[PDB]
Design a protein around this ligand. Structure first.
Ligand SMILES: Cc1ncc(COP(=O)(O)O)c(CNCC(=O)O)c1O
Ligand SMILES: Cc1ncc(COP(=O)(O)O)c(CNCC(=O)O)c1O
Ligand SMILES: Cc1ncc(COP(=O)(O)O)c(CNCC(=O)O)c1O
Ligand SMILES: Cc1ncc(COP(=O)(O)O)c(CNCC(=O)O)c1O
Lengths: 461, 461, 461, 461
């Protein structure tokens, strides 16, 4: 006997799977009972979530709008076309000069799809070094030669670094490397770089060594959409990105590519990039993701989002100024985007130690490498998540006070117990000073609203 | 001025984005107002959709449960661990002998992650030929040498075909190729193969040529979970799959791998496959997909799903017997799984011609290559989608009657106008016989229930 | 104190290095005191040896004639231009349609230089299987996947085989493989194939799969120059060869390439092949080799050489007919070129066993694989070497009598001692029946003249 | 009718091929009627030439001594074994710690055979930049990305350069590159570097980045054998070389490799390198070259050669001091080996201009790139060739006087006519000052003896 559709197919989640429903409720509480400062995280809208969780997940639409393998894509084509036309207008792109593919399952697939389109296997790539604030998908191998990233497995990568004293990108060392290594593709953008990017200088370097210029604006896509940072579309041939970070959308990827006549002969990125996504690398697109993304791109083009992105920068600046006013060191001594990079080596601490104690106070940050590392000696702190909950400068200055108290309690424990990780941990068990900070954090966290779900109806406190 | 969280973050989709909401509603109507026979499609449960569209999309959990880069994954780890333990028990796998990774964004990423883990670039791969019913990600290049699939771009592929008269896999020609070509990996499983797979014979071939044996059970994962077809876990080293087809879950991928002591020395797939998914190829996992997948795997282990998979096989058989009783030819003359492959060359027709007229009657099938093609000459028809709506043998025999009438009207149009596409199309405009079939289809379609959403609350008719 | 030029630089070899001079004298005696039947060996002229051992070894002439890096190549250019113009006329090639590069250090470098010119790394190549009578540089890997040949290391190779019963090339199986594997280059020619090649059929196959057609005529270059076998220049794009085999020249290589307009648009092999030899792969050319080769190409274009090549075929035929008249089996039951392939499996023997006993009678042959091998079960016997010493059919029929007696004594030893290699060897020590054959061989060998050096002045008997 | 062996095989070269014999005679005159200063050239002994031009060219000996495919190698094995034992003692190598393979056809094949043995395709290599005085086979691609050298085609190369002001190897920039690029092999040695190599520093860099260390001592092999320069065997894992330069032997190659226990576990280079030479890359060895090489290695181990190598260094120093005493600039301001690198940019001249006028005075040098080039602006002048003819410091100081007059006439011509090549050439036609230098050169050249052949018996003046 088969179960009727009503029993298995229409019954709500809370009845079909109590375990998963209960676990999702605890995650919802965890997301609003603490302080989330992961620079790559955000809280998306309930409207995006509704499109994400819809019947759009049932449709196979292999191919592109108007050129699908299967029939019955009358509305999938309208949703995708709306999504890519919104993607272009959200970043103020003329359709005669720019095209976009909104089918990458995520940012990492978007980057590897861009590589396949414009490069052959073992072609040379240059990207920002991980320790300097770069990303894996830009190329990464260890000191022993172990090719960690797939970019360094199927292509030959070589990283350019920041100045080992100022923390800024060494554009003179970048040009020197690009002329020796002769990369076929140069990647700009990063995950923990607290300054803006000189895309015009990257263009001069790229032109000098005959390389294509790609920008991975994943972290700052929201700021780019609101024109709160430099636009890579003015100088790069290809722009890839995620959509779930500062853009505040679903987990997905996009690949922007130049179209039309080349500057002082027509660009031919469109077909290569479309073909790389499908049929080369990916199968059917996740239409529910594309529907949710179309919602996020319309929200990203609204005046409220421009104020949000402007607030994100002001909150990261206010947090950084508050930390430096307490004697703490920041890489480059400030920020021009959504995050600050906090150098903890001058304090005799490591990123892990501060990250672990902050997690025990429901303050979510991540240990991060700082220029001149040897054991990451810094923490990366981002503003988008809490800014999406309505926090402004005064609230972020209160976040700096919590971080101030967190590192102060981290030093007192290291002083009492030692600089040995094993010795350090012994000072966190039953520590009543942490529990008073955890409580001030939760109470401060619970004074703000939360997008995506209604707190009034959530199952846990 | 920033928009308050209530305005942008808590407002429902129907108000934030009327366009996308309206388009999703029409897709919902399209999904239940017609007859969906795409063998790779299904209608997932509302419980899966609720987990899919949740706050689980806000969390970055790069890494593995218990081995994450970031903190605050207390409940994400529980959701993922529950998902992998449910994946093992859904396929009756001993945890000491099998492991699974549930982070692949989709089926295509799962396969390429499996390749990266066990193979080096340019390693040789063998998979079922596309024209013989294989998949792109198993390897595909054109006759001009143009490497279409990424599997044939970063690896060296060579396809094995079916017997050009029986339509069955030529296992003697497979062994001959595997001994000449000496592949490092042999892939079994396909997208349009209507018979079961002799995994024991594939093991003999793999052992003879010293190759790893992988099975892509994407299409028949639901049947494998219910033990309605041969289990590849008894003879394959790695088993990859999608989760949104016969498994009736969300759009995602899984990679099963052997662990523990080797048969007549311990398997070492676990770390390679996990490392290939992250940090090599993918970034943060889509936790909402994993939550939705964990729900689907519990539904897949229920007695109702076991009856569903048995019904899928009975419906495809009943549909095939009905088509052969009307004089239509099927590849291999029947089916042992969820689909039938309908050879239309004996009728003087092409798959496209039949697919186009069926699309106008809201009958969704896909043109498909048939063994001995030179313009695909067949159509692939699947049972999972309509079977999930409660259709049984009698209903699928009525579906064959609709297909019978559809091809009968396709021959009458070709007879009157010709084999010229322009002339053929001319016979579909204002054709009243099609409108009588479409009307008979919709009315027949509207007599069944629908999973994922409640039809009583939908916006369109 | 430096040694004067007279002491170190002008003193003959017999005084400077007694060891090496004495060893060269013993090699000279070994070359004329026995019967040399290695199909790839020959005895070159004293004129070739004089040019080989000349002051031409002192000059660096990197580049091509008229486009050298260094000066002082006034006469090197004249020698090389004369060498390549003689190479074209020796093979009856119109200079408007064919070009040649005479700088490959040997045949193996010539083949790999041709590959580099027309192929990118990992491009697919097809060549005659080693066991079917092919060559390493055409591609070879073991059954375990060990890439033996550099052709299979830097390119992807796949061998085509002969019919496992007739011993002829399976052109239908060749076409089948070329259409599945889609090689970018197809290689014809071999080392132990006793029949001619259907180059027109190779052209049809190459055209069908869109591949370039190369012929490695190393073994039969002398027969091609005298037009005693099929000419590959009528159907192949590139022809590579050694010059020290049937061509009877020095150890070197040549690469012939098509020039001018393509048949029913102009060929562009010239610059790629010239560039691949230098500066890509090789350094300075061995001018002494090129001078010696120019001598050999003039000798190859003389009427005496055409009679020699015609005699080589007649001697190999007479030897084969004599062996088959004694009940011995030959692959394909005869020969159309310079060698016979003697299948010893019907006798219960292996090639090694016959080769070892023949070497003890100063009869030089080589064990060779025969179609359908599992321990090579055949011996390869060639005619050029002894034919260059003036032997005709009657003498080669006497060689068959010696081979007849050699295998008869090989069977008597296997009968008395056993089919175990260890047991077999025990029957060769102090065996007086071998010593009577060795003596008849030396006495028969010493009844003919020898090129390259004067036997009257040689140091040993 | 076949030609008897006496007619074609025993007739001397002067009768069989008058053209080639006449051209070889003119080359002999050219070699002794002028001044040869190509740093890569030398005049080998008549004993080497006699072994080079012998019956040793008739024998196929594929494999290794004692492990041959064919029989009848009793004396070829003795010649090769003597050659490898002489190679080891010529460079004072303990046979338990070092092995050598003497089958590379030339230096370029020796290097690529070493790469294949220890590296996989696309493995990273670092070598001295071509403009800084490196060699093609160490890696070379143009600024457009065009991979010129085969080393940069089948492997990924990156060159290290000299200091752009001192002209010395920048070992700090070498270590920086090796730690960024992470090469699997580092190559030391060059073609136009006038100083010695700090192999101990290369070992520190190699050990720091986990790379193998190879030295291409081709140019200075004679000086290494006489211990007149630093020995790379003390710090390198593999040492490759030519044998026809300062070693004063035939055109061939050798690959030295470490064996036995590793320094503070046993080296495994022996089998890989031997297998790479055969059967991977090369076919049958050129036994005549190995015989000639064995002769040269015995001459290289004689006290006369030790004095020769000491004289080569003294002559290059005396020539360099004479040029600097006339106000000419040398890279690094001197020399520690066999050559000087003459910077002509301070004179307003190019290397080509000086090379062309020197070629018209029968002074053979080569234009060469100098550190900081943008049209090579220097000339490379070597001492081995003329030193082998008995020239000492006083004679090389007279060579500098000729070079002084040559460049003085080059400036006088540039002054009168201009820096336009057409105008410059116009000053060399009927120029009586050049004819007075040519006459002074020939008469000076004809006052010295010549190795390889007896001048008393030569056909031309
Ligand atoms: C056998 C098989 N394996 C993997 C995949 C990849 O699934 P994704 O779309 O998630 O990449 C497919 C797609 N099947 C498409 C079809 O049969 O119509 C497939 O058929
Ligand atoms: C700059 C950048 N680009 C691409 C990606 C890939 O996104 P996916 O995880 O969806 O594949 C990331 C992930 N950034 C992760 C972090 O910084 O925390 C990223 O930081
Ligand atoms: C340092 C070095 N190594 C290897 C080679 C290769 O030698 P072959 O020509 O045998 O391939 C050369 C050529 N030296 C050329 C020159 O300096 O003029 C070389 O200079
Ligand atoms: C057909 C063929 N082509 C090329 C070569 C290479 O020649 P070199 O050894 O000079 O590299 C050989 C060697 N033939 C060896 C044999 O059959 O005995 C050959 O047989």
């Amino acid at each position: 006997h088969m179960d009727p559709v009503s029993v298995w197919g229409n019954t709500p989640l809370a009845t079909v799977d109590p375990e998963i429903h209960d676990l999702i409720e605890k995650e919802k509480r965890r997301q609003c009972r603490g302080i989330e400062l992961i620079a790559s995280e955000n809280f998306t809208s309930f409207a995006v979530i509704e499109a994400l969780g819809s019947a759009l997940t049932n449709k196979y639409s292999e191919g592109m709008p108007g050129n699908r393998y299967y029939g019955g894509n009358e509305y999938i084509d309208q949703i995708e076309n709306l999504c890519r036309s919104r993607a272009l207008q959200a970043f103020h792109l003329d359709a005669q000069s720019w095209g976009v593919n909104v089918q990458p399952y995520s940012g990492s697939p978007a980057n590897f799809a861009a590589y396949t389109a414009v490069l052959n296997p073992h072609d040379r790539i240059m990207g920002l070094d991980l320790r300097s604030g770069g990303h894996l998908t830009h190329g990464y191998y260890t000191s022993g030669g172990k090719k960690i990233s797939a970019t360094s497995i199927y292509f030959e990568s070589l990283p350019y670094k920041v100045n080992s004293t100022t923390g800024y990108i060494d554009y003179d060392r970048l040009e020197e490397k690009a002329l020796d290594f002769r990369p076929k593709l140069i990647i700009c953008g990063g995950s923990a770089y607290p300054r803006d990017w000189d895309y015009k200088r990257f263009r001069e370097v790229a032109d000098k060594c005959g390389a294509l210029l790609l920008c991975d604006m994943a972290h700052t896509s929201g700021l780019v959409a609101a024109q709160e940072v430099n636009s890579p579309f003015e100088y790069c041939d290809i722009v890839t990105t995620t959509t779930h970070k500062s853009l505040r959308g679903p987990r997905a990827g996009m690949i922007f590519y130049r179209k039309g006549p080349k500057p002082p002969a027509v660009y031919d990125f469109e077909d290569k990039i479309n073909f790389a996504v499908f049929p080369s690398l990916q199968g059917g697109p996740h239409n529910h993701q594309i529907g949710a993304l179309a919602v996020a791109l319309k929200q990203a083009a609204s005046p409220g989002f421009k104020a949000y992105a402007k607030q994100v920068k002001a909150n990261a600046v206010a947090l950084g100024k508050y930390l430096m006013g307490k004697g703490y060191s920041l890489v480059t001594g400030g920020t021009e985007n959504h995050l600050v990079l906090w150098d903890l080596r001058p304090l005799g601490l490591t990123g892990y130690k501060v990250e672990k104690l902050c997690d025990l106070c429901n303050i979510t940050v991540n240990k991060n490498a700082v220029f001149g590392d040897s054991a990451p000696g810094g923490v990366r702190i981002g503003a988008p998540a809490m800014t999406s909950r309505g926090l402004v400068e005064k609230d972020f200055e209160q976040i700096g006070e919590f971080l101030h108290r967190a590192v102060t309690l981290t030093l007192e424990i290291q002083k009492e117990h030692g600089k040995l990780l094993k010795d350090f941990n012994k000072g966190l068990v039953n520590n009543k000073a942490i529990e008073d900070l955890k409580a001030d954090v939760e109470k401060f966290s619970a004074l703000f609203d939360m997008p995506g779900f209604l707190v009034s109806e959530m199952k846990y406190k």
